[PDB]
Write a protein that binds this ligand. Structure first.
Ligand SMILES: Cc1cc2c3c(c1C)C(C)(C)C[C@@H](O)N3c1c(nc(O)[nH]c1=O)N2C[C@H](O)[C@H](O)[C@H](O)COP(=O)(O)O
Ligand SMILES: Cc1cc2c3c(c1C)C(C)(C)C[C@@H](O)N3c1c(nc(O)[nH]c1=O)N2C[C@H](O)[C@H](O)[C@H](O)COP(=O)(O)O
Ligand SMILES: O=C(O)c1ccc2ccccc2c1
Ligand SMILES: O=C(O)c1ccc2ccccc2c1
Ligand SMILES: [K+]
Ligand SMILES: [K+]
Ligand SMILES: [K+]
Ligand SMILES: [K+]
Ligand SMILES: [Mn+2]
Ligand SMILES: [Mn+2]
Lengths: 500, 500
């Protein structure tokens, strides 16, 4: 079963890539697994597979850390992401984001129901499991709980049955048979939760599947549109209908090769303590516990020798940056295009802690618009910051065609040199804000509103007659024949491999 | 004669450091020398010494490129700067900037006049030189002239004799016996020029010395205070009185071991075309020629086998960033301290194209002030942006004690996560602006005014009770004994030298 369609095959692919370290000696889920993983993420090392996790019982569970983090080499930097998608390991960001967007104007390929799969190899009922007795990691020393859920997919369906959403949202163990987690607007898990709360009749049927098809966890991390069932989007992207099995205790359907499945309900009434958690912006605020959503677990099913993926998130670079940031940028690119804005590319610079998105402008098309910075900034900000895809992003940086937005150095150069503070910016105070950014939820203003800006790093002639500069760099300030001569004589003269 | 006191000795020091490439085959001053130098600066390679420069005649001249640029290794990144100052080549930025500030509360050590020196080994009068016949470089393909002056020091004295200023300002060849160059407010060359213009009696006696003592070219690049003679500041910093010889045609004094000296006048009446030039922010605007100051050259004196230093400036990283940016940051640190502001460190992030300065705050002292972000931002911005030392800097970023301002990654993290756009910022429109930044002189607003901001990346509790977070990183979110265990078992488990 191919790597992008089966998590167990994906692990084998990483091994074969020489992108995995198998740790076969005992590792403590209390901080040690996550510390190793954090170090990996901070240094772009190989993914750790913890095959011998202190507290693993009857097959639950091994851990794979850093499943979507970066590789050290430039040439296959994004290779772990590529392996989620059947792309060559040398794929560019552009190619990865194009693959993730490709299903947006394709017919869905709905899933196929099969009678069984590996995720049914073992089961534990209501009398046989205790979530506090599993080797659930403590990921950061100040976390408010053991965060079992950092890289599984929540499965919830609208009351009318027409939309089944797959998404990543964190959750931690509350007690032997409950989790608490983030369920916040405008996220689809929250939107569906609200539909069940308005109906008022029952708690939300729920499942949480860990170790799902890698192409599915990518779509789980992406803000594809409201009402769109991720399973059929993944089917179209991959060209293959996903095989799903029914849950035992409800009528939801989970990927047949899921490593571990929890089945139960998301309460429409109950809450419990949730957090704090060491989060994507790089911080934890110890003791900042709040009420979160509360999930009841009725059943666990799992593969033999089940593997739990884990994201040890925080400072650069992990899945929150590589997947949540980049996939939000991809959706923003499409949203802009669909609103007739001349955007060619979008990326959330890692340097920005994925709080910015740089938007590359087709300045030929911009010039034909016969507009101004003030007007264009307002138009872009209204599109993006009024939409869910713009939720997590607080600064949009408009750049012209010379800038590669996938290169943070070049984005920082353009921002720093082409956008006059204040004058070339528009502030947005009456939009939804992202409270997890420290300057929002722990800042001087409203946690949930405002704090957003469009920063125009287009130069004035880019709106009118065309770029009127050349860069003072090797590439642009010397003729081709001289540049080539310099490069050809470089080592001969005494100065100093692409793969490495 | 030591490296920091004698340019010829400094060249030997770079050779001995294995930080020099001697090119002994013919190199064209038309773009080729500067292209090689640009490539060096973009890749942190060894400094190029062009010993065989097409058009060199009777000893004028060899070129040393990249004299103050970066080395590839982290461990001796700033070693070329250290060699300007007698510091070990492993010196930190902090140590370099402390050395440059050290003379600010020392008695000056005035210079010593000696009867002769190497700079008098050869001479060319008014009938014997033609600046258009020298191997003056074309540094960028669109430059408006051949920029002879990128790393010499202009020498001008107040009419009353009490202040002799040394500074770097660009200049290009106008004709056989004149240069044009930038002389702009608030720079000291401009301030002194204005004094002579108000007196109205004569042109400004002037000299331009190339290949000066490295400690002198560092002070030439720093905004030490108005009225302070750089020679005595360098004397105090180094503990040694600098040896100066009189010019032949005027009563100014030049370093005895200067490689090349031009003597003449800076006109109080005449201008000529100047620029465009590929500038420190990374751009050239072809055809953007303006009137600049006009210098008349009456005499050249030079060392046997004279060496002209050259800065091939533009995109990262060259002398404009390493020296002008960092030295302005150093002066800003002191200025803040002298104004009773609790600033411990300042640096101009390279990522910002040295348009930002990050100011590290002693938050214990800030808490005792019992102030607010709005108040404190205004106070800092009023100090810095109303002073010459703040001229080139458009964004100040306030950070707390956990941030190393000499690490751009950490500055970008703090800025992106701790400063709410708009609310946590104060815009300054009624301050002098730096017109060379593209968004100023080629932007949407006044070239010379405004466009400045204080961005407060202090979190709210840093003003009150203290930092209330821990970082979600390896360092802060795991206990010491676990971190050490992970590091000790890192290679054993299968994961992957300081000098490299
Ligand atoms: C890749 C990834 C994404 C997310 C998260 C993580 C990872 C690894 C955690 C490590 C678990 C940290 C957690 O903060 N987290 C998270 C989260 N979204 C939330 O509402 N709540 C969360 O707790 N997203 C982002 C969401 O996955 C995307 O916003 C997606 O678009 C949502 O799907 P949908 O609502 O659009 O269907
Ligand atoms: C290190 C360095 C500094 C400068 C420059 C260069 C280098 C290499 C050039 C490559 C030649 C580019 C040129 O744009 N340039 C330059 C310049 N200052 C100007 O007024 N004019 C200039 O043309 N400074 C900065 C000044 O040297 C400092 O601002 C110093 O503080 C001035 O001295 P003072 O007025 O404070 O005495
Ligand atoms: O707990 C987090 O780190 C996290 C990460 C990304 C998130 C994206 C959207 C909403 C909530 C999020 C929470
Ligand atoms: O020509 C330049 O690149 C340059 C560099 C730094 C400068 C600093 C202050 C004033 C003028 C300047 C000009
Ligand atoms: K999703
Ligand atoms: K702009
Ligand atoms: K100076
Ligand atoms: K702040
Ligand atoms: Mn969805
Ligand atoms: Mn001065």
């Amino acid at each position: 079963q191919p790597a992008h369609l089966c998590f167990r095959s994906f692990v084998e692919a990483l091994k074969v890539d020489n992108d995995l370290v198998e740790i076969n000696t005992p590792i403590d889920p209390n901080l040690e697994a996550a510390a190793i993983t954090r170090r990996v993420c901070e240094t772009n090392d190989k993914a750790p597979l913890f095959n011998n996790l202190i507290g693993m019982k009857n097959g639950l569970f091994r851990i794979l850390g850093a499943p979507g983090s970066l590789r050290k080499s430039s040439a296959d930097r994004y290779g772990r992401l590529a392996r989620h998608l059947a792309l060559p390991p040398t794929a560019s960001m552009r190619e990865i984001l194009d693959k993730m967007l490709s299903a947006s104007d394709m017919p869905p390929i709905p899933p196929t129901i099969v009678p069984t799969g590996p995720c049914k190899e073992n089961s534990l009922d209501d009398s046989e499991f205790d979530l506090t007795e599993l080797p659930v990691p403590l990921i950061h020393k100040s976390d408010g709980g053991k965060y079992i859920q950092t890289y599984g997919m929540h499965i919830v369906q609208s009351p009318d049955g027409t939309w089944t959403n797959w998404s990543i949202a964190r959750a931690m163990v509350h007690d032997k048979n409950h989790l608490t987690g983030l369920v916040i607007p405008p996220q689809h898990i929250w939107q569906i939760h609200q539909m069940w709360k308005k109906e008022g009749r029952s708690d939300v049927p729920w499942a949480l599947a860990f170790g799902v098809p890698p192409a599915a966890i990518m779509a789980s991390s992406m803000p594809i549109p409201d009402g769109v069932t991720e399973a059929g989007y993944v089917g179209a992207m991959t060209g293959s209908s996903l095989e799903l099995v029914k849950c035992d205790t409800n009528d939801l359907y989970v990927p047949a090769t899921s490593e571990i499945v929890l089945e139960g309900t998301l309460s429409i009434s109950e809450t419990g303590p949730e957090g704090p958690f060491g989060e994507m912006h790089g911080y934890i605020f110890p003791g900042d516990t709040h009420l979160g959503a509360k999930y009841k677990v009725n059943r666990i099913t799992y593969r033999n020798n089940a593997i739990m993926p884990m994201s040890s998130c925080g400072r650069l670079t992990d899945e929150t940056h590589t997947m949540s940031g980049s996939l939000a940028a991809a959706e923003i690119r499409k949203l802009c295009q669909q609103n007739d804005l001349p955007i060619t590319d979008a990326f959330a610079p890692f340097e920005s802690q994925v709080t910015w998105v740089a938007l590359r402008v087709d300045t030929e098309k911009l010039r034909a618009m016969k507009t101004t910075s003030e007007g264009f900034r307002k138009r872009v900000g209204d599109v993006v910051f009024n939409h869910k895809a713009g939720y997590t992003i607080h600064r949009l940086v408009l750049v012209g065609d010379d800038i590669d937005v996938y290169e943070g150095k070049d984005v920082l150069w353009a921002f720093s040199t082409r956008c006059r503070p204040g004058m070339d910016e528009t502030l947005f105070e009456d939009v939804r804000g992202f409270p997890l950014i420290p300057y929002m939820g722990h800042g001087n203003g409203p946690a949930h509103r405002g704090g957003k800006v469009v920063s125009d790093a287009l130069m004035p002639t880019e709106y009118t007659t065309g770029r009127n500069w050349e860069a003072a760099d090797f590439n642009q300030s010397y003729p081709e024949d001289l540049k080539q001569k310099v490069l050809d004589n470089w080592t001969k003269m005494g100065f100093s491999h692409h793969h490495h």
